[PDB]
Ligand binder design. Structure first.
Ligand SMILES: *[C@@H]1O[C@H](CO[C@H]2O[C@H](CO)[C@@H](O)[C@H](O)[C@@H]2O)[C@@H](O[C@@H]2O[C@H](CO)[C@@H](O[C@@H]3O[C@H](CO)[C@@H](O)[C@H](O[C@H]4O[C@H](CO)[C@@H](O)[C@H](O)[C@@H]4O[C@H]4O[C@H](CO)[C@@H](O)[C@H](O)[C@@H]4O)[C@@H]3O)[C@H](O)[C@H]2NC(C)=O)[C@H](O)[C@H]1NC(C)=O
Ligand SMILES: *[C@@H]1O[C@H](CO[C@H]2O[C@H](CO)[C@@H](O)[C@H](O)[C@@H]2O)[C@@H](O[C@@H]2O[C@H](CO)[C@@H](O[C@@H]3O[C@H](CO)[C@@H](O)[C@H](O[C@H]4O[C@H](CO)[C@@H](O)[C@H](O)[C@@H]4O[C@H]4O[C@H](CO)[C@@H](O)[C@H](O)[C@@H]4O)[C@@H]3O)[C@H](O)[C@H]2NC(C)=O)[C@H](O)[C@H]1NC(C)=O
Ligand SMILES: *[C@@H]1O[C@H](CO[C@H]2O[C@H](CO)[C@@H](O)[C@H](O)[C@@H]2O)[C@@H](O[C@@H]2O[C@H](CO)[C@@H](O[C@@H]3O[C@H](CO)[C@@H](O)[C@H](O[C@H]4O[C@H](CO)[C@@H](O)[C@H](O)[C@@H]4O[C@H]4O[C@H](CO)[C@@H](O)[C@H](O)[C@@H]4O)[C@@H]3O)[C@H](O)[C@H]2NC(C)=O)[C@H](O)[C@H]1NC(C)=O
Ligand SMILES: *[C@@H]1O[C@H](CO[C@H]2O[C@H](CO)[C@@H](O)[C@H](O)[C@@H]2O)[C@@H](O[C@@H]2O[C@H](CO)[C@@H](O[C@@H]3O[C@H](CO)[C@@H](O)[C@H](O[C@H]4O[C@H](CO)[C@@H](O)[C@H](O)[C@@H]4O[C@H]4O[C@H](CO)[C@@H](O)[C@H](O)[C@@H]4O)[C@@H]3O)[C@H](O)[C@H]2NC(C)=O)[C@H](O)[C@H]1NC(C)=O
Ligand SMILES: *[C@@H]1O[C@H](CO)[C@@H](O[C@@H]2O[C@H](CO)[C@@H](O)[C@H](O)[C@H]2NC(C)=O)[C@H](O)[C@H]1NC(C)=O
Ligand SMILES: *[C@@H]1O[C@H](CO)[C@@H](O[C@@H]2O[C@H](CO)[C@@H](O)[C@H](O)[C@H]2NC(C)=O)[C@H](O)[C@H]1NC(C)=O
Ligand SMILES: *[C@@H]1O[C@H](CO)[C@@H](O[C@@H]2O[C@H](CO)[C@@H](O)[C@H](O)[C@H]2NC(C)=O)[C@H](O)[C@H]1NC(C)=O
Ligand SMILES: *[C@@H]1O[C@H](CO)[C@@H](O[C@@H]2O[C@H](CO)[C@@H](O)[C@H](O)[C@H]2NC(C)=O)[C@H](O)[C@H]1NC(C)=O
Ligand SMILES: *[C@@H]1O[C@H](CO)[C@@H](O[C@@H]2O[C@H](CO)[C@@H](O)[C@H](O)[C@H]2NC(C)=O)[C@H](O)[C@H]1NC(C)=O
Ligand SMILES: CC(=O)Nc1c(N)cc(C(=O)O)cc1O
Ligand SMILES: CC(=O)Nc1c(N)cc(C(=O)O)cc1O
Ligand SMILES: CC(=O)Nc1c(N)cc(C(=O)O)cc1O
Ligand SMILES: CC(=O)Nc1c(N)cc(C(=O)O)cc1O
Ligand SMILES: [Ca+2]
Ligand SMILES: [Ca+2]
Ligand SMILES: [Ca+2]
Ligand SMILES: [Ca+2]
Lengths: 388, 388, 388, 388
């Protein structure tokens, strides 16, 4: 069993074709399915699994009330083959209100975080045993990706952030080998707030499109040199911009260098990836709410500032439906390494208040160089059929 | 691990012996079992699984209401070992309101179709990753087999149809190798409407008995030359005829050449297979409704037009019970390749309206050269015990 | 992978130690557990499974009403690792209201029987495919063991009976190799009614202690010569006698030669096995009802007629509790082949009528040459907590 | 496959990092989860499982009433991968109201005990078959560890006690090889009552910190020489002391030699382990009730009597929450063998009487040489949401 060194061309995609959907909320109205959020998917060298931080409970359970809160000690990381809902027989792989998992080619690494917000711990579980651990360094909610990390030749990288959301914070880059933290590089380059990175390999390095929760609606980038642990940060060039809230295509800017200062603050976990001077990217269709989800390429979006020439658009979830977080995931082909993405379809609380709980389902699409049609694949549950 | 080249005599069967039954509807009145339809079964080189397109829900769930509709974005392809009902822990292998799956001897291919009816996409998933994709070519509900496809030496064939049900349409033949579409032959021969093919290998080729939803109650045939992608079509010779609705044994014809123009239009997925100049075939016992199911051989049924000399009849489901779709599936023995078949037992809506849902159970029998008795194995659920 | 030739001394046991219990009825009052009966257990070369013919339904389901009836088309053979209840995710391995399963050392053979009582079929499923089939030969409820069969060097033997319960019948002995019936020897020796045999290997042969449902309360024996298919029958010598109903230890006889003609007719599936001139045997403690269960050795019980000198008694289920069928099962050790037994604990209908259903749980003990104490392990369910 | 000889340094830990949590009680208010108690965890050479003696029932089941009682014949030993709750599909590996399981490196040994309290039997199950058995030797509730045992080079050791709780009793040490009891050493050294040992390897021996239910609040030690079966007993030196009830840190003593005679009698299963002249130990935070749970090192705690200089404290469960039993478990790293521990979080009856049942959830932490924060991870269920 060799290690994943991911040495292969990124496949030249033509768009995304539907891959999987789990129908959790729909199934939750007549079945014992966990309450989750902040989901993601990642595959070992043979198959894909789906993760999500449950809420230590089930939907049709009085305990689901007030599940809007992100961090309680009962959130553990769930893991099932892709396509199988989070039913009672699901393995809570670790305790965590934050996470990242990846397979170096020989085993699974899971970085789980629970604890006081002011003093939390991150355990590094690999191959079943707990190899290392680390503690909060800024005393203000130690956080990580909420999606897969990446390993090249045995050394995995996962970024983490401790500090203020709506403010300045401390972002670091962990290089771990076999569960053991072997180097921590801090953030460098022009980025002003790195949160929830969506990372993918670009041999010999790792690239991430993160979330600026402070001053940018445009997305930061993080370049990790695997060879020496050096790091560089920037922003996307596309004036198209992919964060919510955002300004709006016409009055939207990005110089790839600094936060755009347009509706900047908050955001949502999202992704994007390069292809030449181009960018493949997805965002909610709504710029105020996390509603609907669309994808499209942007000619120039990578290398040329404020470019807004978009082509190959696609709606994954129509605007009249709720979406949420989104990340990317890579998958090795016989000839190239293809990129895919998942979309969190959050329901219930804060927004919908008929019910007192909050959960979600997922939808995943994968890059294809084939052909495809049109559609819309939302959660699908009728809130008036749902418990509570 | 070699590839399945299926080079072996078709076993000389004497009839069919019971193989499996899942009791889904019965179990659904006190258990969380998915709502499905358009089922089928297929085996890898070691075991058999059962597929079905669920309805993104469970029976005892308010969401099962109005599940009579064939295509919503929540239909995904379910897959379990043969004999295990579709419970919450079932893996939705892909998103699809149409499908075909087959194992080349090294891995599983699944062709799933979801999307707009006017613009749908078909994803080609193999070995876990999404290798290819294709789009609607006639803009009118891209469709496929609803049963297993077949692979000879690494190249799998699955047929698909886009166009008008009750009208003329565009039928093509896909040859895919390792998830990658490697050639598309269009329809040839005398066939007027090819829908829902039931294909089986006849080394060095593949033979299908399909569904003419336009002008024939007799069933079309499709011959696929694996060696060169050439294709020929015909109709069955048996005046016995196997589609529903149909005329009736005495006033029923078939010249094996053209649609019989007798109650022709609509139909139902069915199967049949040759043995010399003979044909083994099954159809509902009812010629108006999909009620009951019988099988029998027809001396001459293959090679001699309008032959109606049937022998070895067998009732699988008595006429006082509902049946539905039906397909075939092959299984390699130590000496020959035996053919088997499954029967969809659809319940609920449109016909039975006490309940507002629609689902089904299955029953499967396999060819035997032994002896057997008599019986009847219907769904078994008491609609007055059922939810809704 | 070699074949099981079972060439090893029967371990010199000192009694039985508790092995497994599933708690089905208890679990059925708050969980979806199948309705079953006529259970049994058997192990492959690495682990043991538990079988039972379900009733195509769940206990807390309106469909469980009137489950007292033995043969409906919905009874299928369930199979799980030993210790895991028959929950929704259980695989119905085949359709059957009668059965026997055994592992030749390379694969599992399952003989399943469904169909008309007057015309039923028995399918021979091996390694996943249906290799053979046979039909009713006396037109009066084709039956088989209801427990494991045995294979020596690749040829498995399973006995079957068609004919009258309370009368004369046709009993045959099937020798099948790889699912294919390869010889049928008919019954020979002094036995008058062979039903529900409990067979175990005694290299180079197979020995069975069956059920005389016509004229004997003492149990028939069946000797199968694997080397030539010859067969001999007898009865047990023990005047202690193990069938229910029976006369009673003091006024009970057996000459090992003919049916005792004492409360003879009906009976229940049971077992016994030899050790020198001795016999290890179990029976219900009640001689009218299937209540409680006891085991004990009988000095002389094998070779000396009407012997009633019993030692090492043990109560498995106290007399104030219900039991039922019982069979034996062998398990290969590193030095000898040990024999074990299971007990069916049937509840509900006919006897208990608060509820309208009928099901059961199991308890299994294994031979030990160690020490042990005393106890009683009944079903445990409180009928007043149970559904219906 | 070699045997586990555990030849490696105990890792130099810096404290414990969160490892797993199952959320059983929380999940039990809307899901079918077994009623258990006296849990524990142990890993084979690749993964960890969690055990617990169920109560032959489910929480939302009328049968859970009066589950406060420790020994009924329906208690069987449950086993699932670590992180997966005890749902209906759980395998009851054996019948037992007492237990210990361990993996010699080639297979699992389970010592299960059921039977009369006055006359009980202990079955030795290994590799699936029941290899040996033993009977009560003092006729007064034969008992064992309630946690993992340890095997060095093929010979596993498990200690057991028969006799009076609140009195003098007979404690023995079993050395079993492949399920076969191969030597029984009786207790030696200064210990006055050994119950519920928490054992761990210290090559070439095994060390246990047990429970004195008679005259000590300080914990006994048991030294097992694997090389010759010799045995020595003592008490911990720490004046800090780890049993509940206990006196209180300031007025607490221990000379490592004799029971402290301070609130001595009853107790609770707990653990501790040495590191030089130091001791890592955990106890409830409450000295009257089993409430909350804390851990800390004690400088001198191993080798110097009445030492109370504690450092590196950590609260696992805050004092305002219930805890219970606790044991240790070892896990082999690539360089050293690390020790971990689990905590039973018992709820319901005797203490909380809103509900009539009694069950629990678990929390497990593992030794780390990294860093960590602060927190509290209790059961989490709201008793007013719970059934009954
Ligand atoms: C593959 O498949 C696409 C599917 O496209 C998308 O369609 C829907 C909207 O985006 C959406 O549910 C789904 O998620 C797909 O992303 C094929 O074409 C698609 O066709 C539809 C229908 O023609 C287009 O939808 C438009 O937007 C509104 C909602 O869909 C609708 O109100 C519009 O109404 C009027 O326009 C249509 C032309 O689109 C015309 O037929 C009528 O005159 C209609 O009349 C109205 O006039 C006023 C408002 O429009 C009102 O006062 C009056 O009441 C009435 O509403 C319009 O239909 C959709 O935008 C288009 N999508 C794409 C992607 O092209 C597409 O053919 C093919 N493309 C590819 C790349 O594969
Ligand atoms: C293996 O096992 C078969 C089983 O055959 C099938 O039987 C049932 C009908 O097909 C069905 O449930 C099951 O699915 C099987 O496919 C053995 O024989 C079978 O026997 C039955 C009973 O004799 C035959 O059934 C006939 O059809 C009606 C329903 O089953 C029934 O109404 C008929 O009634 C009269 O006929 C019987 C002769 O069949 C006779 O005993 C009586 O006189 C009875 O009297 C009536 O007279 C009028 C109508 O018939 C009425 O006015 C009056 O009220 C009363 O109803 C009839 O019984 C079945 O057709 C036959 N099947 C097969 C396959 O041969 C078979 O022996 C063996 N064969 C093989 C190849 O293995
Ligand atoms: C290992 O463990 C056994 C357990 O044996 C079995 O005990 C119970 C009955 O068989 C049963 O639940 C369980 O399934 C076991 O198979 C050890 O000994 C056992 O001890 C019990 C108690 O002494 C014996 O039971 C007898 O039968 C009745 C029910 O158990 C009970 O009513 C009897 O009552 C009188 O007898 C006892 C002596 O047994 C005496 O202590 C009292 O004087 C008591 O007084 C009565 O007098 C009249 C009726 O007896 C009434 O008018 C008045 O109200 C009152 O009831 C009796 O207790 C059981 O038979 C015996 N079993 C075995 C197997 O020996 C055993 O020590 C050890 N053996 C082995 C091989 O391991
Ligand atoms: C890593 O993270 C720890 C977390 O420590 C623990 O905190 C809580 C108590 O132990 C517990 O939920 C959790 O399980 C952890 O084990 C970091 O520090 C921790 O900080 C807290 C808050 O400062 C400490 O808690 C103390 O105890 C009570 C409950 O937590 C609380 O009532 C106390 O109140 C007063 O003290 C604080 C100082 O601790 C001060 O800010 C206020 O003045 C407050 O005012 C009160 O005055 C009177 C009573 O105190 C009342 O009349 C009036 O109403 C009001 O209550 C106090 O806060 C906790 O002990 C401390 N824990 C540790 C482990 O140090 C820690 O910084 C870091 N350490 C390590 C090794 O990683
Ligand atoms: C990933 O794996 C390859 C495996 O060797 C690393 O490249 C090796 O580089 C040395 C010089 O550093 C050559 O001798 C090896 O033989 C190289 N590979 C090959 C295929 O020849 C590579 O640097 C690793 N590190 C990273 C970040 O990708
Ligand atoms: C299926 O597999 C066989 C495997 O070789 C293909 O047949 C081969 O044909 C060539 C000439 O085309 C011979 O040299 C090979 O050695 C043949 N097989 C054997 C066993 O000798 C066959 O044509 C393949 N294609 C199809 C449709 O079946
Ligand atoms: C079970 O297996 C053995 C395997 O060979 C069979 O015994 C063989 O008998 C022949 C003569 O028939 C010897 O040459 C073989 O080498 C024998 N075995 C051994 C170990 O030498 C045996 O007869 C088989 N049949 C039955 C009923 O047990
Ligand atoms: C304990 O177990 C290990 C693993 O079986 C034994 O393995 C060998 O011993 C050393 C290093 O452990 C070398 O002699 C071999 O090449 C090792 N093989 C492996 C896999 O490590 C070791 O002999 C046993 N040690 C003791 C002290 O009993
Ligand atoms: C555990 O395993 C080792 C494996 O051999 C045992 O140690 C062996 O001791 C003999 C003398 O008794 C040496 O020749 C072996 O080669 C030793 N091991 C090594 C690695 O050399 C050891 O005693 C066993 N027993 C216990 C309690 O640990
Ligand atoms: C880690 C964590 O729980 N912080 C957090 C996160 N990650 C997400 C959200 C949110 O976008 O709703 C809100 C949050 O407070
Ligand atoms: C693919 C699809 O959903 N079309 C379709 C199919 N396949 C079957 C039926 C039907 O026979 O009820 C009806 C239909 O409309
Ligand atoms: C095979 C079958 O269903 N016959 C049968 C059997 N096997 C058992 C019993 C019974 O003992 O209740 C009763 C029966 O009628
Ligand atoms: C073995 C057993 O059931 N005895 C026992 C045990 N082990 C524990 C407790 C208890 O601490 O509640 C109480 C008990 O009576
Ligand atoms: Ca922002
Ligand atoms: Ca038609
Ligand atoms: Ca009888
Ligand atoms: Ca004590």
């Amino acid at each position: 069993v060799e290690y994943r060194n991911w040495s292969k061309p990124q496949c030249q995609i033509t768009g995304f074709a539907p891959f999987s959907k789990d129908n959790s909320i729909r199934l939750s109205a007549g079945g014992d399915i966990w309450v989750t959020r902040e989901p993601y998917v990642s595959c070992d060298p043979v198959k894909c699994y789906q993760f999500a931080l449950g809420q230590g409970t089930t939907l049709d359970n009085k305990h689901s009330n007030d599940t809007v809160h992100d961090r309680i000690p009962h959130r553990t990381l769930l893991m099932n083959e892709l396509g199988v809902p989070f039913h009672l027989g699901t393995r809570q792989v670790c305790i965590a209100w934050s996470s990242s998992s990846c397979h170096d080619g020989k085993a699974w690494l899971h970085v789980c975080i629970t604890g006081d917000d002011k003093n939390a711990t991150a355990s590094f579980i690999y191959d079943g045993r707990l190899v290392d651990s680390i503690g909060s360094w800024s005393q203000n909610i130690l956080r990580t990706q909420e999606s897969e990390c990446v390993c090249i030749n045995g050394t995995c990288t996962v970024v983490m952030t401790d500090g203020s959301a709506s403010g300045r914070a401390d972002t670091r880059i962990l290089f771990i080998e076999e569960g053991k933290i072997v180097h921590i590089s801090p953030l460098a380059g022009s980025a002003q707030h790195v949160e929830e990175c969506s990372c993918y390999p670009r041999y010999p390095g790792v690239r991430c499109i993160c979330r600026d929760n402070w001053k940018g609606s445009n997305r930061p980038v993080v370049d990790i040199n695997m060879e020496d642990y050096s790091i560089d940060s920037s922003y996307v060039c596309s004036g198209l911009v992919g964060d919510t809230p955002r300004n709006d295509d016409r009055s939207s800017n990005s110089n790839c260098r600094d936060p755009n200062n347009e509706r900047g603050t908050q955001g949502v976990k999202g992704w994007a990836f390069d292809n030449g001077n181009d960018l493949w990217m997805g965002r909610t269709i709504s710029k105020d709410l996390r509603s609907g989800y669309e994808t499209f390429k942007v000619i120039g979006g990578w290398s040329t500032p404020n470019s807004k020439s978009q082509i190959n658009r696609q709606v994954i979830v129509d605007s009249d439906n709720r979406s949420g977080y989104s990340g990317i995931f890579s998958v090795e082909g016989k000839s190239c390494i293809n990129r895919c993405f998942y979309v969190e379809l959050i329901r219930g609380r804060k927004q919908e208040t008929r019910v007192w709980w909050t959960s979600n389902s997922i939808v995943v699409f994968c890059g294809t160089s084939g052909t495809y049609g049109t559609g819309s694949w939302p959660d699908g549950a009728n809130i008036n059929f749902m418990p509570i």
